[PDB]
Design a protein around this motif. Structure first.
Motif, PDB file in Angstrom:
ATOM      1  N   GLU A 131       0.815  -1.209   0.000  1.00  0.00           N
ATOM      2  CA  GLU A 131       0.000   0.000   0.000  1.00  0.00           C
ATOM      3  C   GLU A 131       0.850   1.262   0.000  1.00  0.00           C
ATOM      4  O   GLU A 131       0.586   2.188  -0.773  1.00  0.00           O
ATOM      5  CB  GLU A 131      -0.934   0.011   1.204  1.00  0.00           C
ATOM      6  CG  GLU A 131      -1.857   1.208   1.232  1.00  0.00           C
ATOM      7  CD  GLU A 131      -2.754   1.214   2.444  1.00  0.00           C
ATOM      8  OE1 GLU A 131      -2.651   0.278   3.264  1.00  0.00           O
ATOM      9  OE2 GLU A 131      -3.552   2.162   2.586  1.00  0.00           O
ATOM     10  N   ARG A 132       1.873   1.313   0.849  1.00  0.00           N
ATOM     11  CA  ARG A 132       2.666   2.514   1.075  1.00  0.00           C
ATOM     12  C   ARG A 132       3.895   2.576   0.175  1.00  0.00           C
ATOM     13  O   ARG A 132       4.927   3.133   0.556  1.00  0.00           O
ATOM     14  CB  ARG A 132       3.069   2.601   2.543  1.00  0.00           C
ATOM     15  CG  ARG A 132       1.896   2.833   3.472  1.00  0.00           C
ATOM     16  CD  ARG A 132       1.410   4.266   3.365  1.00  0.00           C
ATOM     17  NE  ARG A 132       0.314   4.558   4.283  1.00  0.00           N
ATOM     18  CZ  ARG A 132      -0.970   4.510   3.944  1.00  0.00           C
ATOM     19  NH1 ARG A 132      -1.311   4.195   2.704  1.00  0.00           N
ATOM     20  NH2 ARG A 132      -1.908   4.792   4.838  1.00  0.00           N
ATOM     21  N   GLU A 160       5.468   3.791  -9.484  1.00  0.00           N
ATOM     22  CA  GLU A 160       5.123   2.559 -10.183  1.00  0.00           C
ATOM     23  C   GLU A 160       5.040   2.813 -11.682  1.00  0.00           C
ATOM     24  O   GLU A 160       4.279   3.676 -12.130  1.00  0.00           O
ATOM     25  CB  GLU A 160       3.804   1.973  -9.684  1.00  0.00           C
ATOM     26  CG  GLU A 160       3.432   0.697 -10.428  1.00  0.00           C
ATOM     27  CD  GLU A 160       2.169   0.044  -9.914  1.00  0.00           C
ATOM     28  OE1 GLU A 160       1.556   0.585  -8.972  1.00  0.00           O
ATOM     29  OE2 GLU A 160       1.791  -1.016 -10.456  1.00  0.00           O
ATOM     30  N   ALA A 161       5.818   2.060 -12.449  1.00  0.00           N
ATOM     31  CA  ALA A 161       5.737   2.064 -13.900  1.00  0.00           C
ATOM     32  C   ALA A 161       4.838   0.929 -14.370  1.00  0.00           C
ATOM     33  O   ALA A 161       4.299   0.160 -13.571  1.00  0.00           O
ATOM     34  CB  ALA A 161       7.127   1.934 -14.529  1.00  0.00           C
ATOM     35  N   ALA A 162       4.680   0.837 -15.688  1.00  0.00           N
ATOM     36  CA  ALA A 162       3.844  -0.205 -16.266  1.00  0.00           C
ATOM     37  C   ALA A 162       4.509  -1.568 -16.126  1.00  0.00           C
ATOM     38  O   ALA A 162       5.709  -1.722 -16.364  1.00  0.00           O
ATOM     39  CB  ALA A 162       3.568   0.096 -17.740  1.00  0.00           C
ATOM     40  N   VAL A 173      10.022   2.968  -9.545  1.00  0.00           N
ATOM     41  CA  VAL A 173      11.087   3.939  -9.754  1.00  0.00           C
ATOM     42  C   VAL A 173      11.415   4.563  -8.408  1.00  0.00           C
ATOM     43  O   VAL A 173      10.544   5.187  -7.800  1.00  0.00           O
ATOM     44  CB  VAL A 173      10.703   5.034 -10.765  1.00  0.00           C
ATOM     45  CG1 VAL A 173      11.808   6.076 -10.854  1.00  0.00           C
ATOM     46  CG2 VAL A 173      10.416   4.424 -12.123  1.00  0.00           C
ATOM     47  N   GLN A 212      20.185  -0.908 -11.268  1.00  0.00           N
ATOM     48  CA  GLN A 212      19.301  -1.281 -12.361  1.00  0.00           C
ATOM     49  C   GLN A 212      17.869  -0.842 -12.108  1.00  0.00           C
ATOM     50  O   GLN A 212      17.095  -0.707 -13.061  1.00  0.00           O
ATOM     51  CB  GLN A 212      19.356  -2.795 -12.585  1.00  0.00           C
ATOM     52  CG  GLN A 212      20.708  -3.318 -13.066  1.00  0.00           C
ATOM     53  CD  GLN A 212      21.685  -3.579 -11.929  1.00  0.00           C
ATOM     54  OE1 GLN A 212      21.289  -3.688 -10.769  1.00  0.00           O
ATOM     55  NE2 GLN A 212      22.968  -3.669 -12.259  1.00  0.00           N
ATOM     56  N   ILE A 213      17.496  -0.622 -10.845  1.00  0.00           N
ATOM     57  CA  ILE A 213      16.200  -0.024 -10.540  1.00  0.00           C
ATOM     58  C   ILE A 213      16.214   1.476 -10.789  1.00  0.00           C
ATOM     59  O   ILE A 213      15.151   2.081 -10.974  1.00  0.00           O
ATOM     60  CB  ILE A 213      15.821  -0.385  -9.088  1.00  0.00           C
ATOM     61  CG1 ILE A 213      14.333  -0.161  -8.819  1.00  0.00           C
ATOM     62  CG2 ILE A 213      16.661   0.384  -8.086  1.00  0.00           C
ATOM     63  CD1 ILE A 213      13.864  -0.748  -7.513  1.00  0.00           C
ATOM     64  N   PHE A 214      17.395   2.080 -10.865  1.00  0.00           N
ATOM     65  CA  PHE A 214      17.529   3.517 -11.035  1.00  0.00           C
ATOM     66  C   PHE A 214      17.421   3.887 -12.507  1.00  0.00           C
ATOM     67  O   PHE A 214      17.896   3.158 -13.381  1.00  0.00           O
ATOM     68  CB  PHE A 214      18.870   3.992 -10.480  1.00  0.00           C
ATOM     69  CG  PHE A 214      18.981   3.892  -8.988  1.00  0.00           C
ATOM     70  CD1 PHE A 214      17.848   3.844  -8.190  1.00  0.00           C
ATOM     71  CD2 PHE A 214      20.225   3.820  -8.387  1.00  0.00           C
ATOM     72  CE1 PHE A 214      17.957   3.746  -6.819  1.00  0.00           C
ATOM     73  CE2 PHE A 214      20.339   3.720  -7.016  1.00  0.00           C
ATOM     74  CZ  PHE A 214      19.203   3.683  -6.231  1.00  0.00           C
ATOM     75  N   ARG A 215      16.794   5.024 -12.771  1.00  0.00           N
ATOM     76  CA  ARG A 215      16.689   5.496 -14.138  1.00  0.00           C
ATOM     77  C   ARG A 215      17.840   6.450 -14.455  1.00  0.00           C
ATOM     78  O   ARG A 215      18.432   7.041 -13.548  1.00  0.00           O
ATOM     79  CB  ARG A 215      15.347   6.191 -14.357  1.00  0.00           C
ATOM     80  CG  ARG A 215      15.177   7.486 -13.606  1.00  0.00           C
ATOM     81  CD  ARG A 215      13.786   8.036 -13.809  1.00  0.00           C
ATOM     82  NE  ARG A 215      13.612   9.313 -13.130  1.00  0.00           N
ATOM     83  CZ  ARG A 215      12.503  10.040 -13.187  1.00  0.00           C
ATOM     84  NH1 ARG A 215      11.465   9.615 -13.895  1.00  0.00           N
ATOM     85  NH2 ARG A 215      12.432  11.194 -12.539  1.00  0.00           N
ATOM     86  N   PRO A 216      18.200   6.594 -15.735  1.00  0.00           N
ATOM     87  CA  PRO A 216      19.257   7.557 -16.089  1.00  0.00           C
ATOM     88  C   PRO A 216      18.875   9.009 -15.875  1.00  0.00           C
ATOM     89  O   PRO A 216      19.758   9.877 -15.878  1.00  0.00           O
ATOM     90  CB  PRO A 216      19.518   7.257 -17.569  1.00  0.00           C
ATOM     91  CG  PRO A 216      19.093   5.849 -17.744  1.00  0.00           C
ATOM     92  CD  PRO A 216      17.904   5.683 -16.854  1.00  0.00           C
ATOM     93  N   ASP A 217      17.587   9.309 -15.696  1.00  0.00           N
ATOM     94  CA  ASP A 217      17.185  10.644 -15.282  1.00  0.00           C
ATOM     95  C   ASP A 217      17.660  10.975 -13.878  1.00  0.00           C
ATOM     96  O   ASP A 217      17.844  12.156 -13.565  1.00  0.00           O
ATOM     97  CB  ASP A 217      15.670  10.779 -15.350  1.00  0.00           C
ATOM     98  CG  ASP A 217      15.137  10.598 -16.747  1.00  0.00           C
ATOM     99  OD1 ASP A 217      15.873  10.906 -17.706  1.00  0.00           O
ATOM    100  OD2 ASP A 217      13.984  10.138 -16.885  1.00  0.00           O
ATOM    101  N   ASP A 234       1.915  13.468  -6.619  1.00  0.00           N
ATOM    102  CA  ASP A 234       0.568  13.918  -6.303  1.00  0.00           C
ATOM    103  C   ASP A 234       0.536  14.760  -5.034  1.00  0.00           C
ATOM    104  O   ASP A 234      -0.035  15.855  -5.025  1.00  0.00           O
ATOM    105  CB  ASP A 234      -0.362  12.713  -6.154  1.00  0.00           C
ATOM    106  CG  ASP A 234      -1.789  13.115  -5.866  1.00  0.00           C
ATOM    107  OD1 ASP A 234      -2.470  13.590  -6.798  1.00  0.00           O
ATOM    108  OD2 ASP A 234      -2.226  12.963  -4.707  1.00  0.00           O
TER     109      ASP A 234
END
Ligand SMILES: CC(=O)O[C@H]1C(=O)[C@@]2(C)[C@H]([C@H](OC(=O)c3ccccc3)[C@]3(O)C[C@H](OC(=O)[C@H](O)[C@@H](NC(=O)c4ccccc4)c4ccccc4)C(C)=C1C3(C)C)[C@]1(OC(C)=O)CO[C@@H]1C[C@@H]2O
Ligand SMILES: Nc1nc2c(ncn2[C@@H]2O[C@H](COP(=O)(O)OP(=O)(O)OP(=O)(O)O)[C@@H](O)[C@H]2O)c(=O)[nH]1
Ligand SMILES: Nc1nc2c(ncn2[C@@H]2O[C@H](COP(=O)(O)OP(=O)(O)OP(=O)(O)O)[C@@H](O)[C@H]2O)c(=O)[nH]1
Ligand SMILES: Nc1nc2c(ncn2[C@@H]2O[C@H](COP(=O)(O)OP(=O)(O)O)[C@@H](O)[C@H]2O)c(=O)[nH]1
Ligand SMILES: Nc1nc2c(ncn2[C@@H]2O[C@H](COP(=O)(O)OP(=O)(O)O)[C@@H](O)[C@H]2O)c(=O)[nH]1
Ligand SMILES: [Mg+2]
Ligand SMILES: [Mg+2]
Lengths: 428, 118, 426, 428, 426
Positions: free
Chosen positions: E44-45, E52-54, E59, E82-87, E127
């Protein structure tokens, strides 16, 4: 004892995809015409197959291609499948004058076909929008011609009013100024439908965060099915449309009523639900349940026509009317003392297989006249005058043969429209 | 003292008052609010589309709104006030407020519409 | 409701070589013209693009225009020229050599008379026309100069159809000739009076999109145009394929154009992401509209935050809910209403196609009109000011028989064009 | 004949988790609404399902997340499940003024929904604390608005008073100064609950060395169920809450009664047990069974309201009243001669499946007014004035819109509260 | 109610590298971001920490900030990058080289403008924000200096959110550069004015915890930070996971801070024991509170018995009974009331999370506020006084364009800060 539904434009045919689907739900009607035992919306063939008395009009074939290749096409006849080949280009001058003139002669002949087939024609209802090309210009062309031929018939429109915050085209206020005075010239009754207020109903009264134009018209047509087919259906107090046309319209030019309906209950909401006659009419007075982005508190009620389904006790309705007089924040006019007309159907309302409202024991439609509607027209007028000051987009109509003075005159017709509900609001 | 002075100034630089267009306009608005001894700051809009028209201040005693810069009425009563708005710093926009009294949390508002000079 | 895509020049033929490459792949069609798809959506709207021959053969209603066969030869010797009939293979010899007065005035006019007959060959075979499409560069001799004579005669023929061309704006970093601002100035001098609308295409901007946003290493001409052709196919198939907001391009041209001379569009494409962020990014409409507002997704090198948005088109693809569409459209209008014009409350037109593209479940396409497009036009004008003084290599065009006050009037139209944006900017 | 329980804050909703569980224990009520035969706390649907008439308020979703994902959620409707999204940050100025104002317009509208559904509203009761953020600030916001709208209704609070030795937050005395005068301005009756004295009862009268907030409210709510639902239930002497409100409060500002209850018997203690009526009322006079850390010996009794369950003989109660007059160390006032009001329920008390009290044949709730309550308020005033002298933590209410003089004024209101029971204690 | 963990420098990137390593293991999540836990508490938290991505991909809402890629490269080349994005992978070249005036003033300001845009990229995707988390050292040039420009602009952006950073106090035993007390002084000169709260971290104190109390032989940076990240995760998951005393950090920031400049915290972790004493010790709450009061369990080298406790936070984990909680809390207050301030009756805030951590059935976390934190600040000030006289290697910062009276004013703020603790000490 018959009348014909009319669907003009991209919007109204998509509404008619929901309407005649709901009209099959009225009797469990199969897609060929098979139904056990009613001929008001229908013509019955010799093989026991019932075909709709509908009008399908679009200058774009694509929406017609959705109909004639979709479901219920065996019900549908190519007599009613009236399509154009060249778009109106979202224009009034092409809708009313340029492109619409090539089709209207074919259309009115199909009207003379089906009206001659009718026995005891009551009238018709046109489904369209205010700011479209086909549903505004050609509707202005169509209602002008039908008033010539059939003067003493019912001239209804259940029209879509664009939101001041949501508009899919910029010329939608630029179209509806010319649409409105011509509509006021001919129509017997005209409604306004704002998708924005319906969006608030979907996210709250049904908690649907993903609605589509299908799912909106599922809500809209279910009301209209209780508006139209139910008033011919036998109940405890059988009133037709025409008795409203005298009672709800006491005016020469006042026929813009507010159609409301608030049993709007999700399937999970219905388990914790026990709503009486009075408790629904309390929800009928909610500003979140008005179907138009407007505030009823600032408007003066002229009329209140109540349309009922299902579990109705008229003595409890008499208490519910007294409850309305008890809870008064309504600012009702002194021109009529207590005119609150009631329409009661004994028959239960219908539930869409695939719809998002649960099975209810009663349904309450409320038709009302108020003066806060002109504030939505005041939203419309500020849009047009800035475009008329800049004189933007005017070359798309002067090149189609329109005059600048006609535009301000219809704005003065729009101004006189605001003068109309001013005289209601001022004098009591 | 109690002021929304930095909140309006933060809503100044983001989206409301300037991009590159009204950059000479905002330098007056910085010069107005620094000399202003008034505490509560009020933003007048034309419409719900967040179109700036005037910057006002609440006195608190007489509950009226005085003009420091912009185009609008000289004084604004709460009867002239139709709706009130709240700016969210995180969402970087103005959010509508339901009906209440004129409070310090009110960062922005709108008026009836008839009050404009025709 | 059919479209003819008359492709011109070394560029726009090769640019459009990627285009119908997408279109047959859009509908699952053999390189010889045989249908192999499984959808009636790919089957019903063939008429708008293709001419069906006997035995399931689909003739692409598109014309390859050049004064040199060499570009069309590589189309013909390569794949997907086999669907093209040799009637679409019209050329002369020799080329204008990127020369406007050779292309527009002296040499190309003879071949255009053969080309316009093939237009008359196809238009009589056409049942219901909607508009004619072109594709070239502004600095193209045979691309623009011949096309300026094409549109001038087609407007004489068909004033009623949608007249759009897809012209490439010359890059300050990409130069091959020095008289390229001569070619772009003489183009827009006739492109305003003859066309209904056009796009602005800068390869220098398309360099950054592949590199900064897509992280691509070697942008070739086809790889840049594969980005272009997806944006080209995103526009007109929404007219073809069904949707809730079935918006005609002629409906679009009414809504996007407030002043009839001001019809220049800023294209953009929202679902642009690298291959690593495929596993890192969800596909939502607020993700796309953020990437719609992104200056780094604009196909033209202009600052949209500097100028003000005249009109905005929101071309949408996929199964979207309108509440997600309309509110997020309003949220952008709630966000940067200062970047709009004042006198219009809704400067954004929404256009939703319900039919999704292949692979991706949703897609979106930005088409904007801003006042900052004149920044590239000042690159045209100021470079023309120095070259009009010293008149370097002008004897090429002078021997063709051109006048300098005609170039000044073409500058004066550019002087008008910048001023007309400034009248509506503030 | 109906009323609504109100649960404001993290504390009161956790109390309401036990209370409506105990209210299901009243009739053997299933978690969907199924019960054989009573509509006072309930609204009954047509399918035979009963939903509570409750108010669930938190600015944090997490306590609401425990409710709407836990048991009895098929009894609970999201009309009652009213949550906030931003915390009050344990603040009065955010609960009353800053954060709580965004929800109260939704809350009071939901109040007007359920109060319109009620027929013969008796009033309400609010469950909260004195030193919380939501249960102090927003309660001060809520009770202010309900007193405007519904003036002639019962305004009850069963509130939690923090211990002078145990406090889970430092601003809990710093909150309750501003809370109390606003509470005194609006409330008809307000209780004080000290967990510290409840800790002494659990370790001795139940011998529980591991209590939780679940197990505390099991003790608390069982009393309140005998306080509230039993007075509508039929017995030998049927008295409601409103007849107490005149009788237990003879004062303009005196309505802080001491709620006591001392049948508190462990399951093993029941075998060594034979308690009469009088023996329990002797245990009602024990200082270890007062539910508030206070000494009744130093306080002057103003009132004594006796509430009974189960095996009651009134002639033996009359002897038990004489037993009270015989064992006198009570220091009863001369302002009332012998006012010892009795309430009797014939119905037996209930036992939680999972509770820690055994099955008894009678249960005795005692409501009393004494002057030693202000000594607990004297514990509160010493905490605030040291923090007011140092001016520590003042930058969170002068960070959120409060004035320094308002703090001392509410302290003088707190001083005037100590002046109130002084005048009771001095004059006789 | 979401948290962004902006990690900075060689230290705080590597410190927070162990952090989300715990957090993904806290909720049973694949290194690619796929959920594999079995609890709704772990389901939940997620929102507070992950995007959450598709297709169930989470992320980490956390930003890696450095002027050198190499630290982030080792994160990326190692597991859990690998969980990290290049952004999140934003850097420049070259590094400041532990230099404040290079990082805060000249070089890092250009990269932060790109970083704060990515902050705006994430915050619009957020949000509901609750606060922003940072992690660095005080002597970190790219760690603190860039972060001092971060928090100064974020407070300009977001005055309303929870502003905490996790900074490492420089150890008298651990030194690499001599101008490390220059950087810590210039940090606190802005960190007091810009932050809402922070922690004090001393690796020298963490050396004693591993060695004297945990009996560990070879403490690495990750092994030190694994002690830190358990204390980091013990704080904020109590806001996330349910409990009886659901105490916000913003509730905590009200209850711990009596003066708006006095917001420095002394962290502690109660269930600290070696592997041999696992068979020698039972797990009770009075065992924990004894180890809460222990001077040898403090993460900063300050004497809690020398100074006096300003405020105390009692973060608790597990299924504890409140009577065991409240009385034992009172027993410590009955024991060492002399170690408290006089004017507050309850200097201890209790915070009970009902949700236990994995492995251990109960856990706890000490957070204290005392006046003895100035002891490490006098290490900073007195070392600054000698270096301000001789100005050794100040030409590194002098050529950057900094003034000495600015450094004296930063000393004057440190002169203010030590005096402010003596106000509430006696
Ligand atoms: C495994 C897989 O499916 O991968 C995708 C993919 O991951 C990405 C990288 C694709 C891919 O596109 C590119 O890599 C590319 C490179 C240079 C120029 C143009 C495209 C893709 O080729 C493109 C392709 O898109 C389509 O098929 C659309 O329907 C598109 N058609 C074409 O682009 C096309 C491709 C080959 C031949 C003919 C047409 C389209 C969009 C709108 C209207 C009509 C058609 C898709 C989903 C993928 C790949 C294969 C990698 C992207 O492009 C599109 C158009 O979707 C680049 O930005 C998006 C992001 C996507 O995630
Ligand atoms: N409720 C509802 N509104 C619709 C639907 N389809 C379109 N609209 C509305 O109709 C308006 C746009 O009008 P169009 O339908 O495109 O125009 P038209 O009258 O059909 O004529 P053309 O412009 O010539 O195609 C907008 O206000 C839309 O929100 C629908 O299915 N339901
Ligand atoms: N007896 C009892 N006391 C409780 C319970 N929950 C909290 N409390 C008490 O309530 C006080 C703390 O108040 P909170 O509930 O946290 O505050 P709030 O009013 O809900 O508002 P916020 O601070 O904004 O969350 C302390 O005195 C606690 O002992 C419970 O279930 N039972
Ligand atoms: N995107 C793109 N631009 C091109 C391509 N070939 C040429 N150009 C551009 O078009 C212009 C040259 O036009 P060109 O087609 O050679 O002129 P022509 O003589 O009319 O064929 C320059 O601005 C080039 O950058 C191509 O394949 N792709
Ligand atoms: N606990 C801990 N401290 C570290 C680590 N790396 C560096 N430090 C400390 O942080 C300071 C150096 O900061 P650093 O991150 O290298 O500076 P920057 O990268 O240039 O900003 C010194 O006080 C070091 O003792 C680490 O991995 N763990
Ligand atoms: Mg249409
Ligand atoms: Mg709480």
């Amino acid at each position: 004892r018959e009348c014909i539904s009319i669907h003009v434009g991209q919007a109204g045919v998509q509404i008619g995809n929901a309407c005649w689907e709901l009209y099959c739900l009225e009797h469990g009607i199969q897609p060929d015409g098979q139904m056990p035992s009613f001929n008001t919306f229908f013509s019955e063939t010799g093989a026991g197959k019932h075909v709709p008395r509908a009008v399908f009009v679009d200058l774009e074939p694509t929406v017609i291609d959705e109909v004639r290749t979709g479901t219920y096409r065996q019900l549908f006849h190519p007599e009613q499948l009236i399509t154009g080949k060249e778009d109106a280009a979202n224009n009034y001058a092409r809708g009313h004058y340029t492109i619409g003139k090539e089709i209207i002669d074919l259309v009115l002949d199909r009207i003379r076909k089906l009206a001659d087939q009718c026995t005891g024609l009551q009238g018709f209802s046109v489904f369209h929008s205010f700011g479209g090309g086909t549903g505004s210009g050609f509707t202005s062309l169509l209602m002008e011609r039908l008033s010539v031929d059939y003067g003493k018939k019912s001239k209804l429109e259940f029209s879509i009013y664009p939101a001041p915050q949501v508009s899919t085209a910029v010329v939608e206020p630029y179209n509806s100024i010319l649409t409105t005075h011509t509509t006021l010239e001919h129509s017997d009754c005209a409604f306004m439908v704002d998708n924005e207020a319906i969006y608030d109903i979907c996210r709250r009264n049904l908690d649907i965060e993903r609605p589509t134009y299908t799912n909106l018209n599922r809500l809209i047509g279910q009301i209209v099915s209780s508006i139209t087919a139910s008033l011919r259906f036998d109940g405890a107090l059988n009133v037709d449309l025409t008795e409203f046309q005298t009672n709800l319209v006491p005016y020469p030019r006042g026929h813009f009523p507010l159609a409301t309906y608030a049993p709007v209950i999700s399937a999970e909401k219905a388990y914790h639900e026990q709503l009486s006659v009075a408790e629904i009419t309390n929800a009928c007075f909610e500003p979140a349940n008005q179907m138009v982005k407007c505030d009823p508190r600032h408007g003066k009620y002229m009329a209140c026509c109540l349309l009922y389904r299902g579990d109705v006790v008229p003595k409890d309705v008499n208490a519910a009317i007294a409850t309305i007089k008890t809870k008064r924040t309504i600012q009702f006019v002194d021109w009529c003392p207590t005119g609150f007309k009631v329409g009661i159907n004994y028959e239960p309302p219908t539930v869409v297989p695939g719809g998002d409202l649960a099975k209810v024991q009663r349904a309450v439609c409320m038709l009302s006249n108020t003066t806060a509607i002109a504030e939505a027209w005041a939203r419309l007028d500020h849009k047009f005058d800035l475009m008329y000051a800049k004189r933007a987009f005017v070359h798309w109509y002067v090149g189609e043969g329109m005059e600048e003075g006609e535009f301000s005159e219809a704005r003065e017709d729009m101004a006189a429209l605001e003068k109309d509900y001013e005289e209601v609001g001022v004098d009591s | 003292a109690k002021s929304n002075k930095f909140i309006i100034h933060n809503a100044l630089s983001h989206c409301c008052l300037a991009g590159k267009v009204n950059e000479p306009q905002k330098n007056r608005i910085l010069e107005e609010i620094e000399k202003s001894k008034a505490n509560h700051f009020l933003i007048l809009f034309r419409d719900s589309s967040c179109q700036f028209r005037a910057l006002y201040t609440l006195s608190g005693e007489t509950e009226e709104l005085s003009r420091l810069a912009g185009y609008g009425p000289r004084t604004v009563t709460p009867a002239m006030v139709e709706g009130i708005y709240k700016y969210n710093s995180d969402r970087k926009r103005f959010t509508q407020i339901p009906a209440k009294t004129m409070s310090m949390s009110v960062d922005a508002f709108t008026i009836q519409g008839h009050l404009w000079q025709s | 409701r059919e479209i003819v895509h008359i492709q011109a020049g070394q560029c726009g033929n090769q640019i459009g070589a990627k285009f119908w490459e997408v279109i047959s792949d859009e509908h699952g069609i053999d390189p010889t013209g045989s249908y192999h798809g499984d959808s009636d959506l790919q089957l019903e709207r063939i008429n708008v693009y293709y001419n069906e021959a006997a035995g399931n053969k689909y003739v692409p209603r598109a014309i390859l225009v050049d004064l040199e066969p060499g570009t069309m030869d590589s189309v013909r010797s390569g794949p997907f020229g086999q669907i093209f009939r040799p009637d679409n293979f019209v050329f002369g010899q020799s080329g204008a050599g990127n020369n406007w007065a050779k292309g527009h005035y002296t040499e190309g006019a003879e071949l255009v008379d053969s080309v316009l007959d093939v237009v008359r060959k196809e238009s009589e075979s056409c049942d219901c026309l909607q508009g004619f499409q072109l594709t070239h560069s502004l600095g193209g001799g045979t691309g623009s100069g011949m096309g300026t004579l094409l549109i001038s005669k087609i407007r004489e023929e068909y004033p009623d159809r949608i007249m759009n061309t897809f012209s490439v704006v010359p890059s300050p970093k990409v130069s091959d000739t020095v008289v390229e601002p001569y070619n772009a100035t003489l183009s827009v001098h006739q492109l305003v009076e003859n066309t209904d609308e056009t796009y602005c295409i800068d390869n220098e901007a398309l360099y950054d999109i592949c590199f900064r946003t897509l992280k691509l290493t070697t942008p070739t001409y086809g790889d840049l145009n594969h980005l272009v052709s997806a944006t080209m196919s995103g526009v007109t198939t929404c007219l073809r394929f069904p949707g809730q907001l079935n918006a005609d391009l002629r409906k679009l041209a009414v809504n996007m154009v407030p002043f009839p001379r001001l019809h220049f569009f800023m294209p953009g494409f929202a679902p642009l992401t690298s291959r690593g962020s495929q596993q890192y990014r969800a596909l939502t409409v607020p993700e796309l509209t953020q990437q719609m507002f992104d200056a780094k997704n604009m196909m033209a090198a202009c600052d949209p935050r500097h100028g003000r948005y005249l009109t905005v088109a929101a071309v949408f693809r996929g199964r979207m809910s309108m509440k997600e569409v309309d509110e997020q459209m309003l949220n952008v209008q709630n966000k940067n209403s200062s970047y709009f014009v004042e006198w219009i409350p809704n400067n954004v037109k929404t256009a939703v196609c319900d039919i999704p593209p292949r692979g991706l479940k949703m897609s979106a396409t930005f088409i904007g009109n801003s006042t900052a497009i004149q920044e590239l036009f000042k690159r045209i004008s100021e470079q023309f000011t120095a070259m009009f003084r010293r008149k370097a290599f002008l004897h090429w065009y002078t021997g063709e028989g051109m006048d300098e006050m005609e170039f000044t009037e073409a500058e004066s139209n550019m002087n008008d064009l910048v001023s007309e944006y400034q009248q509506y900017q503030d």
